[PDB]
Structures are given as structure tokens and as C-alpha cells.
């Protein structure tokens, strides 16, 4: 029933798109796409996979800019100009870029007075950025905050735990890293681009970085700054991917006491948040699943009761995306405006 | 010797400087890239491969935009257009299309706009008007005088070549087919986002590529005898950087074994192709096939007839390689023979060369 | 209903049966799994894929020997020698072959000898009486509890099967090559290490591999209307699961389209090859066709015809989990006609209809 | 009215424009020339033709390079360099070639360079990739988007294709001879002078000129159904504007008869080639087919067999007039294909002109 | 002239070869092998590289089981049982576990055994093993010590220069961890094994594991025990994998400090063993780098000056053979039998 657009369509606009129908009852009135990519390409990219395989569905983009899904048709237009986009043609209420350009605030205002009303972005923007995400700093969304964007996945994938871990035991410090999978952040060979490793190919290697996660952090909490960082990793992964993290924590414990809190944590609030299992698994295990992560709580061994590295997967698209939708269910719901 | 740039900067032009660099004898005078990323990413990018990895040499940046090897001092330009490229800024004659996307005679002819003599093309151009060239091919059809802006057909197309044109005018082909070990490459949608098509989009991390190229056209492009009669699309196929193909094709020689058809090659590989192409017996697989002299390497064993009409080549190459050596040998010929022409002096073609100037000679037009 | 064993976790079986439990009304009581590997080992597969991920429902591990798959009993063992293996004992119907290595019959029949019925393996036949079998094509004419040592070839043999039965029969084929993109295979090692051979020898991980295999022969060895006409290699790709051939082809019938082949096989999709043939028309990559059901799928596009009698098609099979489909299918296959029968309704005064158990009589004194 | 182009006023070329603007409702033509003439000569040069005489309508001279005709404004420009044509500085789309000097798609895309789309020679280039083009051969065989520069092949050959395409087709040649008649043009010698070749040196003016020419192959070019199987002589005769060839074939039917045949292109003149094939009936001689807008002009009685194997086949064509109405009408094609008829090809499905537009990054075609 | 052996010639084998072939001035008279690996295959193995290409050396089998490497023969044959592996047909100098499976004592001795003096195992032994490698123990090695080994490349890599780093700075705790590739050390596809990771397929996936160098730090560091430790992670790669390592130390500085240490580290001590830098490359660039292992200078951010992350590369395979080639003519130094 929210009229949000979709700009950029970004993989995941298919991914919240079968999110979006994989959700059941949608508070989303999300009839509307935007990219350059062709109307049946899109279509297809909706209707086919590399993660998904082909989507289970029905895929006819009505007449052009209309997509007939299950009969839902959906607009979609090929257009990079913000205030070209028609969010006033149905009035927008939510921005939902993909281009991963957006992390201005001044785009989202392209878009917002084009016809929309709420911003949120994937990625962290840059910025005067609110930050937003389940379980941390959701609950903050109010309806005069419009502009926001959303944590990354991997910023989403710690986010609460790890301040209810510094909850549970409190921190001291803290330092994580992805196993990231590689994405459009780098050219598939090493071709010209701002950092010479998101440049790089290593389509066969991985790309030490750090996403604004191992700042992100302290954006998203109210004092988990700074002493909580780490880097970021993407890595030869096309699929859901983890993360790692050593955390430097106050209570003295043991690991499996910890996992237990991180049990016990998993139900009620982390309830389709995240999880923490021990059957040994590896990538693929957790395609296309719900929570952002699970916890090898076997292997989130601990170095005297402070020194404590942790296991930490994510669904990097979908479950991103899931919380994307969670974060937008979130605004979609309590809509005062 | 002979001003030499690259319009862009593909993955090629690294490796082919890297060439062009190891390539000893260089009549070429490389000077300056159009890489739209400054000394810096001109210098990270080509100093590391994917594949040869950290060059053995120095990328010393000179300038901010200029960048030497161990003493090749070298500019590199930035701009994505034409016309603002020092060619004529820089005598440059010889040029090298690295956006892949001046297929045009027009964008060359803005480099020449700019000053350029003679570029080439990695791919082949959809300007039908230039005629496209590969060594031990057609190399030989370029004299002088031809084509300016220059051209030359797909490393796909420029590995077949010769021996398609060898076994056949070896054995005689009415018609048939070919796929390729085709790569992973960037002008494919590492993941799933549109690209026009679904095909390169589709993550080829994990997938061949459906689609149709032009090798099994671009084939008679310089053969003339091979006209339409081949075809089917190769095929581009998860792999860093290995390009192996096979064709199987009719025959109307008498059909003898798969075997006298690689004496045929080692033939050709001999003869007219020595270094230019090779071929193998040792049962090898993709990677070893590695920095390539040949644009055609080929196993003994895996050739096979059935009814002398069939028969299978297994063939193998890199586009890098193959079109750098290729492009290593081409500006040689054009450099050995376009600049510092020095015609002959026979008077028998004394006026055909001002008829090749001009051929609305007092008499020269012939045949209307 | 009919006593299913798993010998060795074939990882064919794995999905045949994820199939099976994926199937509707298999009259295939699957009972067993001899994994060398324990209930733990033999589970863990069960609940989770490489291609399809963890399974829909739970396999949930009963006692530390025989599990359920959701309240189906299953039991497992740990053995590697079929006359090690109690299948009377547990009545064990048919061979479930997932050791993937006794393509000999004895070894396989003694699994019969075990207690068994009917041989079944994903074995090219090592021997020849072996009956080369496949849905599609040759299925109908297995004689109920005749020769119980069957099994089915090759993924791509028994993918080949509908078209390289269709195309002739619809076409008419003199002979023709084939060449599928084969995902890397289990048996053959990951890395540059020890092997039987030099091929495989390699990390077709990042190489790729094409190689003999007996398919065409199979095929043939199945439908010798073309027998020793057609050849072609697989191709090894780093694919966890893809499997599409292509077919170059000198046909008989006059240079005619591809879409009349392609409607033919409309035809022959709505022909008996229903199912396990597919007409593919929407541009599509390999992973799409994931957990696909056709041993064929044909583009649209690809279909070429080269010089009307020379055409290139391609084709396109879930190497494993189509196979695997495949496998379910034959085993129903033969479940329906499965020895349920009226068990020797026939009557002769014939004293071999009597000694035929009392073989031992000089009276009848069996012919031999 | 599209901005089609000429290069040069190439003795043919005023006569396609009079024929042209001759011509009632063509979608088609050029704003401006470029040679050495001066319009008002141009226009002299144009008006009273030495053959066609002064034109039915007076194009006034708006200057040394502008001019209307007869109310149509028209450029022309002085120059000899296909460089600096002010093509796209006029919106060119498609031109013409004059000189003749370009028997290369490199002089070619010069044109296309200085902004036009495609070009057409009258006269057989040496670019195998250029396929020449003539009525009722290779038309819908011509598709736009393929060789973007093309030229047609000698009138003799755009006059030789039109029966032949059907002659062998209906008949059926072993292998046979043609021989034609040629009227004396510019590029022989009028009063025996120097040309590098010794044949098109001599005073043309009274001997005739004995020459070969490609013709009889360049005709396989189009048309390799008949490749190698004919070759023959042209015949330079000292005629104002006038040809007529006599080719001699053996023909698998028998000693079929001539008329027949006629008949049959009594048939295919009533057929393919409406205007273009012609056979008449009438005791006719070099003028008495001046400024027909047939090619091909065949008497049937004048034509006849020798052994019923052997047939020859007397067929006149104007080289100058018959050109035009076949290429002015040839050029048509390419307006009948042309690139969307600039009209409603891109309902946003393609987001492609964009990515025509922003060649590079939105990597929507890049082939590689 | 040290008449070394190796059974079951793995991948360390043409490794080592080749490393004996590029180290020139070999006192290493290594002439005898064994593997399952064909005769000729071998070769081609070494003669056909997945990693270093096909081997740019002259190659022949001579008669059968000698190999004349560019002319130098090496016997070898194929077996497995130590006792018949006939190791007394040249009074074998050294053993080198190639195989892989004989990590016990016994057959290490069974080897001397069977005709040779001294064992190093190419792996982390079984238990009761010292180990000797670079950095540490090399020195602490006596030719007395016959059956030793060399634990994994990665503990190869790891070991020094965190010790030196500890010595130099004084580590109150750590937790590393590799980015380790795929390897023959799990299957290649879905298969079964001991553990279900590597019995995964996985070669798109990651195994959350620990090698034994998360421990041998203790079996090799005397102060740096316990306290030192983390996990494993067989991450997507085919080749030369990185390693991260957080540690809470006592030394308060930032990176920098530590950088030019570990700077001045090569300066002194990983010269020809490790490396470091921050000149950002993916791992290929790492490849055939005889200096073993390789840091990101950069990235290694401080926390609070004693939680320290830290990045480290390592050519798991050429510098791992390389470390053992140097171990191995430092076993041809002061060799004492
Ligand atoms: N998973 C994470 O936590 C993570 C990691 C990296 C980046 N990000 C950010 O989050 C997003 C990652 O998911 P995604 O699926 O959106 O990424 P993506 O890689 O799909 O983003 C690119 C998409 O934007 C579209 N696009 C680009 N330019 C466009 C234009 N001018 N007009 C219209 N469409 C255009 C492309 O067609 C494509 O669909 C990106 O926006 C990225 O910046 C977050
Ligand atoms: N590398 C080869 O040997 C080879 C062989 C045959 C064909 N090709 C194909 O041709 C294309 C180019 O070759 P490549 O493999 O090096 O690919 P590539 O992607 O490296 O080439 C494109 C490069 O040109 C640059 N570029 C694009 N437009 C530019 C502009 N206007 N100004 C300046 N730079 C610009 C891009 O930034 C990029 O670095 C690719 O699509 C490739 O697949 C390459
Ligand atoms: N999966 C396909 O598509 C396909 C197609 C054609 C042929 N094949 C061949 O047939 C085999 C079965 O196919 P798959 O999909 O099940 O892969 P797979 O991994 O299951 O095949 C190997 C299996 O055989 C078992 N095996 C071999 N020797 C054994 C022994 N002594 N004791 C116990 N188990 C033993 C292994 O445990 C393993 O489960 C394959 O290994 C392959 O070689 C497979
Ligand atoms: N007129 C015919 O009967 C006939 C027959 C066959 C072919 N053709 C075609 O026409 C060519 C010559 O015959 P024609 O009818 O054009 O007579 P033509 O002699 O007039 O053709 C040459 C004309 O092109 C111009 N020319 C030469 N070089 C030029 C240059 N760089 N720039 C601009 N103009 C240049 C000359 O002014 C000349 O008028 C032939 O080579 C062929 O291409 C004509
Ligand atoms: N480079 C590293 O990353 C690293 C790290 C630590 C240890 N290692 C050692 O090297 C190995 C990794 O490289 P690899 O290629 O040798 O791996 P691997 O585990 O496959 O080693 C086994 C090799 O030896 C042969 N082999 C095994 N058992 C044999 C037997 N009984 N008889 C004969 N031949 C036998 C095999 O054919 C194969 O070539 C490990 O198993 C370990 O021993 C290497």
C-alpha cells in the first residue's frame, strides 16, 4: 500500500522484488522500478537468477514501464536523472536506489521532489546519513526523518548482537572483516577505478577493504565507536557471504556461555534477524535464508574471557534485502504521512 | 621508432605494452596511452596481471600522467574522446583502440583527426570499410597505401585464421562450425545486471555464454574462399584468460586420417606459420596454454574424422597473446613499411605510383 | 515399494533421492544407504547441496545407524564389497549403485547375489550385455526380469538420447559431432595432482578439459541406426552443475531450417520425449537451467544449420540432477513392470517346466 | 530526401541524378557534390549531355558550388580528398562513388568518417568483404547493418547477373563463355596514349579494345553458384554509349532450344527482372536500346543455340543510363532497409541508443 | 649432496623441485621419489603448473623411475609402504612427507627405516614431532634431530615476525586467521571426508576450520602459547592465500610503529622469508614470491594501541617449499650424519 519506486535497479531489486513477493502481505504499494535496463532484460534478471535460479513466478512487464508479476504490474523506466524519474506520477512515497551512486542526500531531494517522500538507500550513504537498520537504530524512524539510507548488510549483519553482546558482556574492543562477496564495486577485470582493488579483477582473489560497516558501527550505535572496528573483505564468494570478528569484550566468560546469550538472544529479539548454529557448514548453506546470519558458536572460540573471535555469515543480498524489506516493512508500516 | 599510442586502455594494451616492452626490437614508438585514470591507474593496473602478474620491469609514474619502464618514459592521456588526443600533438601515426567501442572509422578517423595515421581495432570493426588483418594470414595483403585507419578482426577470428585457411585450402572445406573455450571477459556483466541482452549480464563466474560472435564470419573476412560457409556460434565459457577451440567442418579432400591433417599443420606450423601458430601432441589442458606465441595451438589427438567430410581441430589460444602478437607484429609492418616508404623505381609503375596517388591519371583509370 | 538400497552415497543418488522423496508415488522402496560413512557422513549431504543447497524437509538422523527422511525409515551401512552387503537379508530389490565404480556386471550382479533383483548403476557398460539404457529411447523394450545387470551410461549419454534419437529420426543423419559444456566431475581430481591419465591430471578448476568418451558410442551402442557416425568431446568446465551439448551434423534431408527440426522437436517435446526433452525459446544461461527435469533442452537460437545437410544444435541437461530424474525415471521405469506379476501363471507338461528346478535330471539333462 | 550522397560528377553521375530526378518519387537524394567542375559547367556538364543530350528541365546555377534544379537546390563542392567532405557537416547519410579510384571500403569510410552511413561505388571494388549489389540478385540477399560500405559491380556484370541468376536456374551451365561489346569510356585512351596498361593505352577511338575484366568472375562474386564456371572477354568498341554481351554456355538440357529459354526470360523479364531483363524481338543495334531502363537486353532471335549443350545469348545494356536506372533504383534497398527508416524502432526495450549514446559503461553491446 | 627424499611427490614436490631446480648451488642431492602419481605424470605435473605454468625447464623420465630434470635424474616409483618404499637404495639423507598421510613417527622412522637418517614431515607432525621452520626454530634445530617437520604453510608463514612482533612489542593475546584456499586437503566436490566442510564440494565455498597452526605458534613460540590462537578459514582461492591475525598486545603504538618493526623485521630477519608492504595487490600478485609471507602495512589498524588486527598474506605453496628448501640445505648445513 506504500507507493515506493525503485531506481537503480540493483540486484536487490529482484531480491527485495522476490522479497516483496516472497513477503506476504505487502504494506508496499511498490509499483514502480527505475534503471537503464531494459524492460524484458529486467524482467528476465527478475525472472532469472544466478543466486535464485529462475524466479518461481510470473514475469510480463505490462505494456513498457509496468511489469505484470502474478498480476502485479510494476513501473520501471530507463533514467539516471533523478528528477526525471516520475515519482510524482504515482506521488513516491519511499526512494530505492540501486545505482549505488546515491549515497549523497541531494539525489534522494532529486528524487523526493520529483514525487517521493521517504528515502532510505542500501548502502550507508555519505553524509548527513541516518543511519537505520532492525534492532539498533530502526526504532528511531519517525515520519518527519525522510532522507535516511540503510546500514550495509555487512554493518546490518553484526549491528545488534554486537551491541547486545557489549549488552550482555560489554566490550572493550573490537574487530571485525567480511568474507564479502565480490559485487559491482569492482570491474570484473582490473580496469580503471578509484580504488586499484575495487579495481582489480580478482574475480579469483579478494578485495581488503573496509566498508563504512567498521564505522558504520559507531554510526548506528550511540557510543560503540572506535573501539569497535575492523576491515572489510570482499572475496571470491558470488554468493551469501560471512564475516569475521574478534571482539575484545568486559565480561569474563567462555565461549559457549556467550553462545547461550547469543541463543538466547536469537529468539526474541533476533527473531528473523540472525541465528548462531554449529552444524559445520560452509557459503552456500544459507542461500536465500530469512535471518542476516548465523553464528558458529563453536568456532567464536575466546582468548581470556576478553579476546573473543566470532562467526558471523550473511546473506549479503537477500537477507540484506529482507532486512531492507524489514527496515522498509518498518517504515511501510507506522506510516503517519 | 614510428609514434605509437593506444586510443583507451584495454587489459590488451597492458599486456601488449608488456610486449611491446618485452617485444625487443620495437620499430614502434610508443610515447602515451589513453587510460582515463591518470599515471597512477595506468601504472597499478598494467604493472599487475591477473595472469603475468607484477611486471618484471619499473612503472616509475613520470608527471602525474607520464610513466616510464625502466627508462621508457611514456605519457598517458585521459579523455574519452577523440579528438582531444596528441597524436598530431605527438606525431603519433600508429594508434591501438582500446575502449572497444571505435569500432568506427569516424573515432580512428578523429584520431587521425587528432593527428593519428594508423590505428587498430580489438575486435572486429563493424565498419565493414576497413579490412581487418591477422598475421600469417593476411598480414600480408597490407602494403601501403591501404587503409590508413587500419583494422583487424577478434583474437577469436585472428587465432582460427590460419589454418582454417591452411586446412582447408590443405583439405577443402564446403562449409561448418565452430564454438570456443571463450573467456570471462568485462565486456560481460561479471553478475547478473543488464547489458541490453541476458547473456553477458548473466554472472559468467558461473556459466558459458549463449551467443553468437563474429569469428565464424569474421573467418572468410580475410579468406575469401571460406564465404558464409561457416558458422555457429563460440562459445565464452568460465575461464581467466584461456581461449581453446575446436571446429569440425565437411571436407571434399579424400578424407584421410585425423592424423595427416596435423602433418598438414606441422606443415603449416613449419612453413608459412612458424612461431606464427603451433601445434601439439602432449595431451595439455587450459591455463598451460599460457603467454602463447601462436594465435593457433592445436593438439594431434583430438582431431578426428568419420567420413572424411567431419573433422574436429582442437585449437587453442589467448586473445591477449594473439592480439598483442598480432599488434606486435602488425605496427612492424606497418612501421617497416609505411613510414620510411621508399618506393621502388621501376618506371613500368613509376606513374602508378602518382596513379596511386592519383588514379584519375592522364591514363591510368582501367576497367571503367 | 520396491526395496531400494543406496550402494555407496552416490552423489547421483543423492538427488535421485532428494528426487525420489521429491517424487510423487515411486513405487521405489529406497531402505538403505551403503555410505561408507555412517548416519552422520550419509545425512549431512541429504540435508544440504552443493547445486541445490539444504533440502526442503528433514532427513532427520534416527540412531547412529538407519534414519528417516521425515518419518521414512531408512537405514544406512558402511561396506565397500557387495557380497559384504546383507540385501537379502533387508530383501533388497534393486542395485542403487552409487560406488560409482563396478561397471562390471559380476561385481554388480553380486549385489543380486546380495539379494538383489536388477542391476542399476550410472555405469557406460564396461562389458557389452549391460543393456545400454535410457528413458526416451530405449526403455520400453527392457524385458521384465530379463537381463537384471542393466544400468544407464554417461549423464551425457543418456542426455544425448532423445535428440540423437529424434534428429535421425526426424532428419536423418549420415553422421555428426556433438560437444557438451561438462562441469568438472567428482571422480576427476580438483588440482594439478595424481591421476590415471594426463588429462584429468589437471585444476580443471580453472583449466578446462575435453576428452574421448564413449557416449557417442553409447548412444550408438543404444541406437546403432547411427552406430560409429557421430563423435565430439565433452567439455570440462569449472561448472558445479552444467551440462548443455551442441551437435554439428551433416544431415540427409535437404538444408531445411532449424525451426521445423525445432517444431519437430515441439513435436517431440510433445513427442514421447516429453519431459526429458525440452524446446528451449527464451534466451536463457546455464545455471538457468538448475534442477532442471529434460536429459534435453534445445535453444531456439542455436540451432543452426551450417550448409543444410551440416547442422549445429545445441542441447541442454542437468548433467546430474536430470540424470538424476533420469535415474528415478528408469527405476520406475522398470518399478511398473517390476516382478509383481502373477508370478508364473504359464503351464506346460513340459519336464523342464517341471525340472526346471530339478535341472539335475538326466531325464530332462538341461541343453548347455 | 534522405541526405544521400555522391562522390564526384563521375560521367555516371550526373546521368543517375538526371535519371534521378528522371526518376518520379525516389525517397532519396543528394544536396551536394564535390569535384573540380564549376557548377555552371557542372550544370553544362549535367544538362547537354553527349548521349542524353540537354536535360527536359533547367537546374539554374545559384553559384560556383550551389545550384537548384530546376527548382531543387543542390550543392556541389571542389575537392579531391574524402577526408574534409562536409557529410555530416551536410548530415550525409549514404554516397555514391564517382572516381572509381576506391576500390576500397578504406577510401570508403572516409566518406563514412566525414559523416555518412554507407556508400555505393559503380564499379567493382577489390573489398571481397563489399558485396556488389544488383536487381533481382542479391537485394534481400543486401542487408543494412552488414558491410556497411558496399558498391555494385560492372553495369556489364549488373546487366550479367539478371538472366544468368535465372539462365543456370532454369537451364543449368556445364561451363560457358560470355562476350560483350563496350562502348569507349574515359578510362581508355581516346588518341593512344600512356596508361601503364598497354590494352587501355591505344587510340580507342577507331581500334577496338580487346580487354579482360573480373567481370566474368566478379558476376561469381555475387553469384558463386556459377563460381569458376564462366569467364569471357569484354570488347571496347568505338560506340558513343552502347554494350551488348553474347554469352556462349553448355547446358546440362540437352540441346534444349533458345526461344524457350527467352521464353523463360520472356518468363523471368515478365518475372524478377520487370525493367530490368528485356527481350525483344525487334532487328535492334547500339542505339536502338539507348536510355531503355532495362539492364539486360536480349533478342530472342538474335539469340540461339549450337549443340543444345552449347547456347549463346546476345543481351544489351547502355553502360552509362542502364547503370543509373539499376543503381539509382540499388540505392533504394538501403532506403527500403534503412536504419529504422529513422521511425519508431526504440520503444525504450531497447535502452540501447543511450547505450549507443554512452558506448562504454551502461556495456550493453560490448561484444568484445 | 644431501640425498634427500620425498614420498608421495604433492604439489610441495615440483614446489620443492622446482624450488631445488631455481635454487641453484643445491648441497640437496634429492634423486629419489615416490607417489601414486605416474612416472611420467610427475613431470607433467612439474612440467604443467596450474600455478606456475607449465614448468619453463627441460623435462624427461630417462630410463623410467630417475627423471632427468633439465638432464639431473631423480628416481622415484610408485608405493606407499615405507618399508617398501626402498629408501636404502641411496641411504636416504632426508625424509619429506609429502604424502600427506604417513604424519606418524613410526612411518617417518620406517622411512630411515627403510633406508634413509633425518624426517621432515611437510606437515604439522602428529604429536610428538619438533618442528623446525624459519624464524624460530631453525636454529633451535640440530642435524641430532632426525624425524622433524615443517607445519603448514600458513603456520610457516605466521610464525616469525609475530613472534618478533611479540618480541618487539609483547602480545598479551591473539586470534588469527587464514584466508586459506582450496586445497587436495578437502574434496573437490560434494564427496565424504572426516569433517563435512572440506567433504563439501565448496570449491565455491569457505571452510570455517583451525589448522594446527592456530596451535603450533605454542608447539614453536616458548612464550607465545595459548594466549596465541585462533581459527581457520579455507576460503575461495585456488592459490596463494592471505591470513588475518587481531592480537591483544602490550606494546602501546600504533601500526606505523609496528610497520617500520615489522619493516626493519624483513630489514633483519624475513629477508628472503617474508615480506611486507601496502601497495594494494590482490594475492595472484603474491604469486612465486619467495619471501613466503607478505602484510599489509596499512591495514593493520590499533585498538586501544593492544587490540591489534593485522593482515598477512602467504604463498601457501611456492614460499611454503621455499621455507622447507631453506630448512632443507640448512639441514644440508650442519649436517652432521
Ligand atoms: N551488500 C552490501 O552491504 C553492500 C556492499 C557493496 C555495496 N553496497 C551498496 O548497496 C547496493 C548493493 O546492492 P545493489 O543490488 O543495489 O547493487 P548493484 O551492483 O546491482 O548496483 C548497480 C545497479 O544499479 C543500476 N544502475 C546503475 N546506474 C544506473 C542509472 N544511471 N540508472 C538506472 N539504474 C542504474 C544497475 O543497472 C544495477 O542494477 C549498491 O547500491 C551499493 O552501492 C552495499
Ligand atoms: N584483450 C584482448 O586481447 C582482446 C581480444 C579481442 C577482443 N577484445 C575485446 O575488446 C574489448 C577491449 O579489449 P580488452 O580485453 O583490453 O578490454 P577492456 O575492457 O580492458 O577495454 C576497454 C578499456 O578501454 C577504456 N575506455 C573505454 N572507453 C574509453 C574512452 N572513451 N577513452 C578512454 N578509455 C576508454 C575502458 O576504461 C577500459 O579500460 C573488450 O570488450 C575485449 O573483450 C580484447
Ligand atoms: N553425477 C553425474 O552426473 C554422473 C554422470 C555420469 C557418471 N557419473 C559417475 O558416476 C559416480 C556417481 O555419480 P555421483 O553424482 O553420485 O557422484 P559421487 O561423488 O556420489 O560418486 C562417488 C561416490 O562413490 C562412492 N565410492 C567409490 N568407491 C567406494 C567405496 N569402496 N566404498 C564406498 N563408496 C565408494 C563414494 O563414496 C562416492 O559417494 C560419479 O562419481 C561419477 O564418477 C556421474
Ligand atoms: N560512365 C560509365 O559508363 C561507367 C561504367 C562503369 C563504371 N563507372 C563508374 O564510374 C567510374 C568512371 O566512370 P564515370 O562514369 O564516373 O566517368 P568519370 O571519368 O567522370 O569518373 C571519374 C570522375 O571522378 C572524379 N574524380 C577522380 N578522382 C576524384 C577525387 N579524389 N575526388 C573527387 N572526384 C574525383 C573525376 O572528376 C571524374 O569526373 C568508374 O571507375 C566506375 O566507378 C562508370
Ligand atoms: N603447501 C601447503 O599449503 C601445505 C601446508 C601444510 C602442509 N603441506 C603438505 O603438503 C600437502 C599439500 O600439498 P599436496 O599436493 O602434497 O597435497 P596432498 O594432501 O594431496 O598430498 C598427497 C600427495 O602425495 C601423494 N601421496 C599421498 N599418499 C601417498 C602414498 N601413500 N603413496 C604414494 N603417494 C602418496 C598423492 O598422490 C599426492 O600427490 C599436505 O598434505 C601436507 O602433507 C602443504
Not at chain 1, 531494459?38 to 518461481?56: E, M, P, R, W
Not at chain 1, 510494476?74 to 506520477?89: A, Q
Not at chain 1, 537498520?133 to 549491528?159: F, K, P, Q, R, W
Given at each position: ?22 513477503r506476504k502481505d505487502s504494506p508496499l504499494d511498490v509499483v514502480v522500478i527505475n534503471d537503464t535496463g531494459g524492460v524484458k532484460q529486467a524482467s528476465h534478471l527478475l525472472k532469472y537468477d544466478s543466486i535464485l535460479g529462475t524466479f518461481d513466478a510470473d514475469v510480463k512487464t505490462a505494456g513498457d514501464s509496468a511489469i505484470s508479476v502474478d498480476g502485479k504490474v510494476i513501473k520501471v523506466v530507463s533514467d ?258 | ?208 555464454v549463449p551467443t553468437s560472435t563474429g569469428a565464424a564470419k569474421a573467418v572468410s573476412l580475410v579468406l575469401p574462399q571460406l564465404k558464409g560457409k561457416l558458422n555457429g556460434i563460440a562459445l565464452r565459457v568460465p575461464t581467466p584468460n584461456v581461449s581453446v577451440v575446436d571446429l569440425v567442418v565437411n571436407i571434399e579432400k579424400v578424407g584421410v586420417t585425423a592424423e595427416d591433417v596435423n602433418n598438414a599443420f ?103
Amino acid at each position: 500500500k506504500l507507493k515506493v519506486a525503485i531506481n537503480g535497479f540493483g540486484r536487490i531489486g529482484r531480491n527485495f522484488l522476490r522479497c516483496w513477493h516472497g513477503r506476504k502481505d505487502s504494506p508496499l504499494d511498490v509499483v514502480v522500478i527505475n534503471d537503464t535496463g531494459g524492460v524484458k532484460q529486467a524482467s528476465h534478471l527478475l525472472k532469472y537468477d544466478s543466486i535464485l535460479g529462475t524466479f518461481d513466478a510470473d514475469v510480463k512487464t505490462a505494456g513498457d514501464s509496468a511489469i505484470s508479476v502474478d498480476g502485479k504490474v510494476i513501473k520501471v523506466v530507463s533514467d539516471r536523472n533523478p528528477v526525471n524519474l516520475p515519482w510524482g506520477d504515482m506521488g513516491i512515497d519511499l526512494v530505492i536506489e540501486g545505482t549505488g551512486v546515491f549515497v549523497d542526500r541531494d539525489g534522494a531531494g532529486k528524487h523526493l521532489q520529483a514525487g517521493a517522500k521517504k528515502v532510505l538507500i542500501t548502502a550507508p550513504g555519505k553524509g548527513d546519513i541516518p543511519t537505520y537498520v532492525v534492532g539498533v537504530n530502526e526504532e528511531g524512524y519517525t515520519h518527519a526523518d525522510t532522507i535516511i539510507s540503510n546500514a550495509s548488510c555487512t554493518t546490518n549483519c553484526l549491528a545488534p548482537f554486537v551491541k547486545v553482546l557489549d549488552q550482555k558482556f560489554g566490550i572493550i574492543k573490537g574487530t571485525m572483516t567480511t568474507t564479502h562477496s565480490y559485487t559491482g564495486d569492482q570491474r570484473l577485470l582490473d580496469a580503471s577505478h578509484r580504488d586499484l582493488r575495487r579495481a582489480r579483477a580478482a574475480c579469483l582473489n579478494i578485495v581488503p577493504t573496509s566498508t563504512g560497516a567498521a564505522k558504520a558501527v559507531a554510526l548506528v550505535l550511540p557510543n560503540l565507536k572506535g573501539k569497535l572496528n575492523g576491515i572489510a573483505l570482499r572475496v571470491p564468494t558470488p554468493n551469501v557471504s560471512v564475516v569475521d570478528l574478534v571482539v575484545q569484550v568486559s565480561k569474563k566468560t567462555f565461549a559457549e556461555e556467550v553462545n547461550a546469550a547469543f541463543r538466547e538472544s536469537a529468539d526474541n529479539e533476533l527473531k528473523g534477524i540472525l541465528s548462531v548454529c554449529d552444524e559445520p557448514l560452509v557459503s552456500i548453506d544459507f542461500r536465500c535464508t530469512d535471518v542476516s546470519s548465523t553464528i558458529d558458536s563453536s568456532l567464536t572460540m575466546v582468548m581470556g574471557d576478553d579476546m573473543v573471535k566470532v562467526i558471523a555469515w550473511y546473506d549479503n543480498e537477500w537477507g540484506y534485502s529482507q532486512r531492507v524489506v524489514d527496515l522498509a516493512d518498518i517504515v511501510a508500516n507506522k506510516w503517519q504521512x | 621508432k614510428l609514434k605509437v599510442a593506444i586510443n583507451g586502455f584495454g587489459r590488451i594494451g597492458r599486456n601488449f605494452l608488456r610486449c611491446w616492452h618485452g617485444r625487443k626490437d620495437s620499430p614502434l614508438d610508443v610515447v602515451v596511452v589513453n587510460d582515463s585514470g591518470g599515471v597512477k591507474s595506468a601504472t597499478h593496473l598494467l604493472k599487475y596481471d591477473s595472469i603475468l602478474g607484477t611486471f618484471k620491469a619499473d612503472v616509475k609514474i613520470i608527471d602525474n600522467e607520464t610513466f616510464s619502464i625502466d627508462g621508457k618514459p611514456i605519457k598517458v592521456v585521459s579523455n574519452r574522446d577523440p579528438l582531444k588526443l596528441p597524436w598530431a600533438e605527438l606525431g603519433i601515426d600508429i594508434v591501438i583502440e582500446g575502449t572497444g567501442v571505435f569500432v568506427d572509422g569516424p573515432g580512428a578517423g578523429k584520431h587521425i583527426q587528432a593527428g593519428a595515421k594508423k590505428v587498430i581495432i580489438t575486435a572486429p570493426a563493424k565498419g565493414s570499410d576497413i579490412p581487418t588483418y591477422v598475421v600469417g594470414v593476411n598480414e600480408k595483403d597490407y602494403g601501403h597505401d591501404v587503409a590508413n585507419i587500419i583494422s583487424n578482426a577478434s583474437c577469436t577470428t585472428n587465432c582460427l585464421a590460419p589454418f582454417v585457411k591452411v586446412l582447408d585450402e590443405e583439405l577443402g572445406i564446403v562449409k561448418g562450425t565452430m564454438t570456443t573455450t571463450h573467456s570471462y571477459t568485462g565486456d560481460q556483466r561479471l553478475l547478473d545486471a543488464s547489458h541490453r541482452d541476458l547473456r553477458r549480464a548473466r554472472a559468467a563466474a558461473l556459466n558459458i555464454v549463449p551467443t553468437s560472435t563474429g569469428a565464424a564470419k569474421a573467418v572468410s573476412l580475410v579468406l575469401p574462399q571460406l564465404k558464409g560457409k561457416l558458422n555457429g556460434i563460440a562459445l565464452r565459457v568460465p575461464t581467466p584468460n584461456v581461449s581453446v577451440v575446436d571446429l569440425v567442418v565437411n571436407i571434399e579432400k579424400v578424407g584421410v586420417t585425423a592424423e595427416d591433417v596435423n602433418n598438414a599443420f606441422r606443415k603449416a606450423a613449419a612453413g608459412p606459420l612458424k612461431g606464427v601458430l603451433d601445434v601439439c601432441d602432449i595431451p595439455l589442458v587450459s591455463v598451460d596454454f599460457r603467454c602463447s606465441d601462436f594465435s593457433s595451438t592445436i593438439d594431434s589427438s583430438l582431431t578426428m574424422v568419420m567420413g572424411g567430410d567431419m573433422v574436429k581441430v582442437v585449437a587453442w589460444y589467448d586473445n591477449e597473446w594473439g592480439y598483442s602478437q598480432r599488434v606486435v607484429d602488425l605496427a612492424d609492418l606497418v612501421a617497416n613499411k609505411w613510414p620510411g616508404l621508399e618506393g621502388s623505381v621501376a618506371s613500368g609503375d613509376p606513374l602508378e605510383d602518382f596513379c596511386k596517388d592519383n588514379p584519375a591519371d592522364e591514363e591510368c583509370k582501367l576497367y571503367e
